[PDB]
Write a protein that binds this ligand. Sequence first.
Ligand SMILES: Nc1nc2c([nH]c(=O)n2[C@H]2C[C@H](O)[C@@H](COP(=O)(O)OP(=O)(O)OP(=O)(O)O)O2)c(=O)[nH]1
Ligand SMILES: [Mg+2]
Length: 292
Amino acid sequence: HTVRAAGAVLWRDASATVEVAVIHRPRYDDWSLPKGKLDQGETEPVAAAREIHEETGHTAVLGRRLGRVTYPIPQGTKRVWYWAAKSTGGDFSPNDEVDKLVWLPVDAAMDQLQYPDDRKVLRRFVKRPVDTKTVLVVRHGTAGRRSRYKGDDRKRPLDKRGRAQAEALVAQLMAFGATTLYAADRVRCHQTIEPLAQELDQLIHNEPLLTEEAYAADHKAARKRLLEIAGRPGNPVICTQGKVIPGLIEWWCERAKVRPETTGNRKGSTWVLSLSDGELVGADYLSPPDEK
Ligand SMILES: Nc1nc2c([nH]c(=O)n2[C@H]2C[C@H](O)[C@@H](COP(=O)(O)OP(=O)(O)OP(=O)(O)O)O2)c(=O)[nH]1
Ligand SMILES: [Mg+2]
């Protein structure tokens, strides 16, 4: 009864001079935003990136989440999550669903879009900056129980499910154009982004200030380190622990007056922090890749 989809406001810098992509589908003779249904096991961001490529022929990097829409379809209810997405390459070619694509300034695109829920999404897009950089704060994957581990608990490794979460995070974090890697000084934090390190061929920088013990004793040192990592070129992944993340996220959202639409703290979850000129403009919580 409820069909789950994901899509994007794909934009390009025409010089940044923002134009957004609007696609035409012969089946309905309509103009809309690229989007499609989630495949089995696929997360919303991974589906959004795939649909951009399938419907527009562009590669893109997702940025800020633009909320969700719900509308009735003959089958019941369509529910779609949307992202801002910056084109990074490729080109349009016609496909089974799409015969035309136009690139328009936002005011012209608003007039071209015929569905109310697409115009609501485009309004969300123009409300805040879209040429953003992204900090990806990841809680390490499942690693069994402290109680049932003999050895230094710092060496406690991911369990099978956690190793699978770590593999599933590669497509999720590459959808946001991850480029640099940071982990708290715990094996289970490093192992979570080990698969991404191999995909990027990139080293993980160890972070002694971002462990639970270090955070609990010196919040301020951890906040300063987060802002320093965030200031460096690239889109950093920071993998840390359950008693660290809520504190850091809540502190930054209060300071920037940013209200997260979703929240949680599960093992394997990701916070997508969107920055524009050093200011937080979005804080998007993504469930673990193996959970709804
Ligand atoms: N794309 C889109 N279609 C909408 C919106 N509002 C609305 O009533 N519709 C209509 C168009 C169709 O009559 C119907 C189903 O269209 P759809 O695009 O959601 O579904 P679909 O299965 O054809 O396509 P897709 O999810 O595979 O991309 O819903 C909207 O905001 N966007
Ligand atoms: Mg589609």
